[PDB]
């Protein structure tokens, strides 16, 4: 089953949280994720740019690969 493509945050967050867990284990991902949203908010456009371009490339490749994808949630 095809999973929905990841945004720019998700890309950067994925990068960070691996190093952060290597660095300091027995830290739960809840503290981790609060920390990373906090951090990401503080970056400039300049800083964000490669992750933005990366997520663009990912969405492009996802559509290219699965042409007939449609995001189908399960609403409450």
């Amino acid at each position: 089953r095809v999973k929905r493509p990841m945004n720019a945050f998700m890309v950067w967050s994925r990068g960070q949280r691996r190093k952060m867990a290597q660095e300091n284990p027995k830290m739960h991902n809840s503290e981790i994720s609060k920390r990373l949203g906090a951090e990401w908010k503080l970056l400039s456009e300049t800083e964000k740019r490669p992750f933005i371009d990366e997520a663009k490339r990912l969405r492009a490749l996802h559509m290219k690969e699965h042409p007939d994808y449609k995001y189908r949630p399960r609403r409450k």
Partner: protein, 100 residues
Amino acid sequence: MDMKALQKELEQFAKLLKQKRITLGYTQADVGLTLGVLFGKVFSQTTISRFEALQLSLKNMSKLRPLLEKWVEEADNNENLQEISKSETLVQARKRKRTS
């Protein structure tokens, strides 16, 4: 002329529109915003979603189709411009650093 052929052409167009917006890296919200800016009429993310889902009045689909065509033209122009400019900067910086 008939609703069958028109809906067929429109549904294929909607697919093509999505294709292009993805390959150009615009979010749905982005397309709305830019359409807003270059035709002076705001368009919500919602209506764009509805468009790409062929969940709009045939009239509305065909009402927006010209606007999207002009948008796609302008978008693609900007892409080509940026692409050429970027590679230009590349060649420039390269040669410069090299000789220096």
